[PDB]
Amino acid sequence: MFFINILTLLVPILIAMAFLTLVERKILGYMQLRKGPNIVGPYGILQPFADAMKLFMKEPMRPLTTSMSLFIIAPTLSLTLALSLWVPLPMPHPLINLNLGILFILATSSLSVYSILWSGWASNSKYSLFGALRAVAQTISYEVTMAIILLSVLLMNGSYSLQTLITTQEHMWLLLPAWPMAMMWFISTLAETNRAPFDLTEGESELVSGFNVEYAAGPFALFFMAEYTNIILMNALTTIIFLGPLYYINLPELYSTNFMMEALLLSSTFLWIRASYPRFRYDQLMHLLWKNFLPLTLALCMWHISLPIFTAGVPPYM
Amino acid sequence: TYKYVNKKEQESEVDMKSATDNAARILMWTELIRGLGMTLSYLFREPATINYPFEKGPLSPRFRGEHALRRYPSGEERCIACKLCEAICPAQAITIEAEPRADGSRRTTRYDIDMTKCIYCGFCQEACPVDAIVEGPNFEFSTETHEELLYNKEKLLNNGDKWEAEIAANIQADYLYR
Amino acid sequence: SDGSSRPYRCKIKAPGFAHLAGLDKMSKGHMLADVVAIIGTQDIVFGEIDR
Amino acid sequence: MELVEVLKRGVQQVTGHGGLRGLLRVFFRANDIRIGTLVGEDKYGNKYYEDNKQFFGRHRWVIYTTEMNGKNTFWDVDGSMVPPEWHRWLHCMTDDPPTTNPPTARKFIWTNHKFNVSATPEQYVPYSTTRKKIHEWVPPSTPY
Amino acid sequence: SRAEYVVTKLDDLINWARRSSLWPMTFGLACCAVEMMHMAAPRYDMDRFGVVFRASPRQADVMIVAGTLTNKMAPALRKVYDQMPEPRYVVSMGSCANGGGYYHYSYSVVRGCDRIVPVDIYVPGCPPTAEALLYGILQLQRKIKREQKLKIWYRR
Amino acid sequence: MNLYTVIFINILLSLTLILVAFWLPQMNLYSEKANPYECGFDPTSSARLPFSMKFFLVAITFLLFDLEIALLLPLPWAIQTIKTSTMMIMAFILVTILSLGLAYEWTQKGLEWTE
Amino acid sequence: KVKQDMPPPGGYGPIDYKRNLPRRGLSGYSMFAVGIGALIFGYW
Numbered sequence A: 001m002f003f004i005n006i007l008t009l010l011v012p013i014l015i016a017m018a019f020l021t022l023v024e025r026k027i028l029g030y031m032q033l034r035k036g037p038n039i040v041g042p043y044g045i046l047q048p049f050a051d052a053m054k055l056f057m058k059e060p061m062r063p064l065t066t067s068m069s070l071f072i073i074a075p076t077l078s079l080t081l082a083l084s085l086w087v088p089l090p091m092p093h094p095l096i097n098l099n100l101g102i103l104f105i106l107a108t109s110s111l112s113v114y115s116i117l118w119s120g121w122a123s124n125s126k127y128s129l130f131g132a133l134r135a136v137a138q139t140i141s142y143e144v145t146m147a148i149i150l151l152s153v154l155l156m157n158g159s160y161s162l163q164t165l166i167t168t169q170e171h172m173w174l175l176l177p178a179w180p181m182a183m184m185w186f187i188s189t190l191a192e193t194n195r196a197p198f199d200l201t202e203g204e205s206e207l208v209s210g211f212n213v214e215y216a217a218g219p220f221a222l223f224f225m226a227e228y229t230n231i232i233l234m235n236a237l238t239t240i241i242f243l244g245p246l247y248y249i250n251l252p253e254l255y256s257t258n259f260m261m262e263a264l265l266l267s268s269t270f271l272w273i274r275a276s277y278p279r280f281r282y283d284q285l286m287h288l289l290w291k292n293f294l295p296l297t298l299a300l301c302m303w304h305i306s307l308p309i310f311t312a313g314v315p316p317y318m
Numbered sequence B: 001t002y003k004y005v006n007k008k009e010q011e012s013e014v015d016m017k018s019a020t021d022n023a024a025r026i027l028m029w030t031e032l033i034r035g036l037g038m039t040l041s042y043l044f045r046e047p048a049t050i051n052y053p054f055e056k057g058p059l060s061p062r063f064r065g066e067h068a069l070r071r072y073p074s075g076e077e078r079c080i081a082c083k084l085c086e087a088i089c090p091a092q093a094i095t096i097e098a099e100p101r102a103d104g105s106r107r108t109t110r111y112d113i114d115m116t117k118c119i120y121c122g123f124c125q126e127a128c129p130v131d132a133i134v135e136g137p138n139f140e141f142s143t144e145t146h147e148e149l150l151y152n153k154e155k156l157l158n159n160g161d162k163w164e165a166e167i168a169a170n171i172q173a174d175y176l177y178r
Numbered sequence C: 001s002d003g004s005s006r007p008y009r010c011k012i013k014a015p016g017f018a019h020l021a022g023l024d025k026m027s028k029g030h031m032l033a034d035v036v037a038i039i040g041t042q043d044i045v046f047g048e049i050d051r
Numbered sequence D: 001m002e003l004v005e006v007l008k009r010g011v012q013q014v015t016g017h018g019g020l021r022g023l024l025r026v027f028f029r030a031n032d033i034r035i036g037t038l039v040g041e042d043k044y045g046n047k048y049y050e051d052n053k054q055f056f057g058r059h060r061w062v063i064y065t066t067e068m069n070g071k072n073t074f075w076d077v078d079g080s081m082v083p084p085e086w087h088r089w090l091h092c093m094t095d096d097p098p099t100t101n102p103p104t105a106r107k108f109i110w111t112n113h114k115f116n117v118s119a120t121p122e123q124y125v126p127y128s129t130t131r132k133k134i135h136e137w138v139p140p141s142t143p144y
Numbered sequence E: 001s002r003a004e005y006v007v008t009k010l011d012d013l014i015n016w017a018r019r020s021s022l023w024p025m026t027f028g029l030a031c032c033a034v035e036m037m038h039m040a041a042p043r044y045d046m047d048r049f050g051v052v053f054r055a056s057p058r059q060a061d062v063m064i065v066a067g068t069l070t071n072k073m074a075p076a077l078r079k080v081y082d083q084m085p086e087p088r089y090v091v092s093m094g095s096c097a098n099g100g101g102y103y104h105y106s107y108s109v110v111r112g113c114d115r116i117v118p119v120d121i122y123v124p125g126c127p128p129t130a131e132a133l134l135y136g137i138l139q140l141q142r143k144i145k146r147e148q149k150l151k152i153w154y155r156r
Numbered sequence F: 001m002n003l004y005t006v007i008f009i010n011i012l013l014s015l016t017l018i019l020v021a022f023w024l025p026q027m028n029l030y031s032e033k034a035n036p037y038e039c040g041f042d043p044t045s046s047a048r049l050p051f052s053m054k055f056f057l058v059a060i061t062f063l064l065f066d067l068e069i070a071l072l073l074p075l076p077w078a079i080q081t082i083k084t085s086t087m088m089i090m091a092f093i094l095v096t097i098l099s100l101g102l103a104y105e106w107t108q109k110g111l112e113w114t115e
Numbered sequence G: 001k002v003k004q005d006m007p008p009p010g011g012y013g014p015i016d017y018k019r020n021l022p023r024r025g026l027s028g029y030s031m032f033a034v035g036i037g038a039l040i041f042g043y044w
């Protein structure tokens, strides 16, 4: 009965990941005054499945200069960590209930940067090495602020358990007492997931395709499934943390439906953002995060350390 | 007369009213929200797409497309092998041979257009004194081999008979501009 | 013109030819992502540059 | 209110193709279920519709026949299947359909259109249309 | 037979996936590449056929030769074509690519891209209108639809 | 045990898709296909040569700040102490010297990338 | 009578060409005032 419960997590997520590729191509379409896919199936609904099938019948590439062990490991790691980020998410009851879920999300997210690094390095190509060394630069940019932002929000929550955020937001979104951190949190998630205007590791304009330039076929498909799963998860995580869905102990179906509506809406804003802005320069990404966000995040960390103290609003341990 | 695109240094003083506006611009990302608005407005505009191949892009009667050899209303070929289309062709795309016919007429035994040399300039259409060679309105004639794009006389006369109904009306709509 | 109906010499002065030659100069102390911008700002079409 | 008018046009389009079979047939062949005015039809079976309230470029369109010249074109439709009389109207090179301004008849004009025959056994094959130029000597057929 | 029938429908299945996802390589040479950008523009929106431009030849299915191929660029065009994973298709677009075009007699031009790579579809014009290229692209999908790889494997 | 099961299931899917990708397609290997990519021309040198890091000082400053995260992450448990004055004073100082350290590096052109 | 394509008598109506990006939005104080209100109520 637990195996059936994995099915009803990993399969709906994978289906939802695929259609995000369709929603991306049609929202980008209509925002660009065109229609996006709409021939492959009714309104393109079969277009995601065509792309998947075609990619797994495409010849896979084994470049002569490549380090095969890491070349193969990297896409496999990418998609594993994308699916593993989901098992602790409470919706409103998580598949795996962890006391330090927030750290499991932080630690799993960091380890997924090594799929970019190892793949790029293992390709033994100049454009793939440029892409990898932007993954290093991008992580050094957003890592420090992203952890501290979480610390600030969790001092109103009382613990690193994700399931306790449901109870913190019983009467109010954390977005209100924390909208400065949500603004900084949201931009971090665009950097965490290599999403425009921060698609610097890929960055088709400057690097031909960045880290995955030497990847074709099914191995390259796994990288994308990982990229789009993370988009849903990071916005799903942002919905739990800051936009707490309605939770009634008698209507757990209500929390999921409301959780989905806000997660879909936030996922759309990622697609909305990609259609609206030019791409950052990856040196300027560091300056954004270290010279703007970091000074503000440290101050808000000190604000939220003191805030429960001088209002006697310390969250409970349990 | 000239104008400055990026000059504005008629420096004003930063009022507390104005400084707080600069800060809200920077902290609240206001100009970046304006850009999000412009792409949101486009989402609710009707797309400019047309439903090809069921809908077609507009064309004018002058459209320079696929070539064709025309006839007179009696069915006689208009081409008299004058070779002026050949002398003008910028691409040397036309090859012609001629001789007296069985009835003594001046007619071509060969007439080729290598449609892979052609630049579709329409100059042959202008040079022809009897409207024999024209560029019809067809543009959907891509092939699966190079050799199919070397048109000999039979092929070009067949295009003439295929498209005459439409060629004749386009000349009727445009010859007065020529 | 040599007096005939065919030109004797025809040299085209492509504006983009000298602009491309200034790409090196305009790109001192810039990153790869700026060379992408400097190429775009010069308005480069290679039909005229190469001929 | 306006939202209801929109659903009115939506219903009117869903039921305006003659049954469920009609709506599925048009929707999966053209991926479009608008309701134009039938302007005419050709000897091959293509139907020509128009709606002048649409913006220029979608105000005219064709639903290709499902069988032309013995070929099955229920799924394989290409723009070369429009004959030359409608080719001019469909491309907005004129303003009046052939049903009211027919082309001048000629005895050599093709009666039967022919679409792109590339890849098929009907495909054009180039060749030299001149005759031999140098004639060779023929030796005597007898001993000397 | 039953197996020979099943192989036929499996053939349609794999073809359909390749017909419905053609990813041309971001790659144009001269003025013909401007009309290829118009086919991507809103009016024609090739994306609605499942046609997405991808920069890397590893991720690309189709190479559209959209402009003149000079001798200096001939080896490089072949190299990016070799690096395309198979199956892979070439659309030759324009007179320059089709057979040299306006530069057929130039000392520096390859008289047709089909001396360098195998070409599937030839699109005439200088340039072909975006619809002409679109007709050619859709004529490549029908060519794939006629593919019979699995059935031929069965009869080997 | 559940958390071990769900992750093997994740790994097996990633493995299973990896095997299908390599043994399902029809592969035609030759030298010119499997060479490295570099925009159509041959690479002029291997990609394993040194690649100068213009942000190296920020890289090692990330390490120092990374460990200063490890000192602030116990705070959610620390605000449960009776010695609230002490907990708060230590917290304020810790964040303030991280800020003072950051200001010094910022003013020393330490955040600037080496040209 | 000569029939050539020409502009109508009087000419065509004026055509806008200058930049016309509107000035719009709340004041600096209103933005900050709302945000600081939202924090204060959230902290309470």
Ligand SMILES: CCCCCCCCCCCCO[C@@H]1O[C@H](CO)[C@@H](O[C@H]2O[C@H](CO)[C@@H](O)[C@H](O)[C@H]2O)[C@H](O)[C@H]1O
Pocket: A309, F084, F085, F086, F088, F089, F092, F093, F096, F097
């Ligand atoms: C070199 C870096 C230095 C920069 C950083 C300096 C930080 C200094 C912070 C000083 C703030 C301490 O603020 C101090 O908080 C404590 C407890 O929180 C308050 O103390 C009060 O509350 C505590 C419990 O909370 C009671 O037990 C106590 O009897 C009462 O006095 C003090 O009244 C207040 O003055």
Ligand SMILES: C/C=C(/C)[C@H](O)[C@H](C)/C=C(C)/C=C/C/C(C)=C/Cc1[nH]c(OC)c(OC)c(=O)c1C
Pocket: C044, C045, C046, E026, E027, E028, E029, E030, E031, E033, E034, E036, E037, E040, E052, E053
């Ligand atoms: C990003 C993805 C997409 C789908 C985009 O919408 C479109 C379709 C891709 C574009 C813009 C280019 C596609 C191919 C290519 C490399 C063209 C050559 C080119 N490119 C030019 O500029 C860009 C020129 O500028 C004067 C040129 O002369 C020439 C010759």
Ligand code: SF4
Pocket: B085, B088, B089, B090, B091, B092, B093, B094, B113, B117, B118, B119, B120, B121, B122, B123, B124, B125
């Ligand atoms: S259109 Fe121009 S290039 Fe083509 S055959 Fe006529 S004259 Fe020659």
Ligand code: SF4
Pocket: B078, B079, B080, B081, B082, B083, B084, B085, B086, B096, B127, B128, B129, B130, B131, B132, B133
């Ligand atoms: S087509 Fe016209 S120009 Fe050419 S040879 Fe015939 S009559 Fe002369």
Ligand code: SF4
Pocket: B119, E030, E031, E032, E033, E066, E067, E068, E093, E094, E095, E096, E097, E101, E102, E125, E126, E127, E128
């Ligand atoms: S065929 Fe004509 S339009 Fe195309 S590249 Fe050559 S000259 Fe340019």
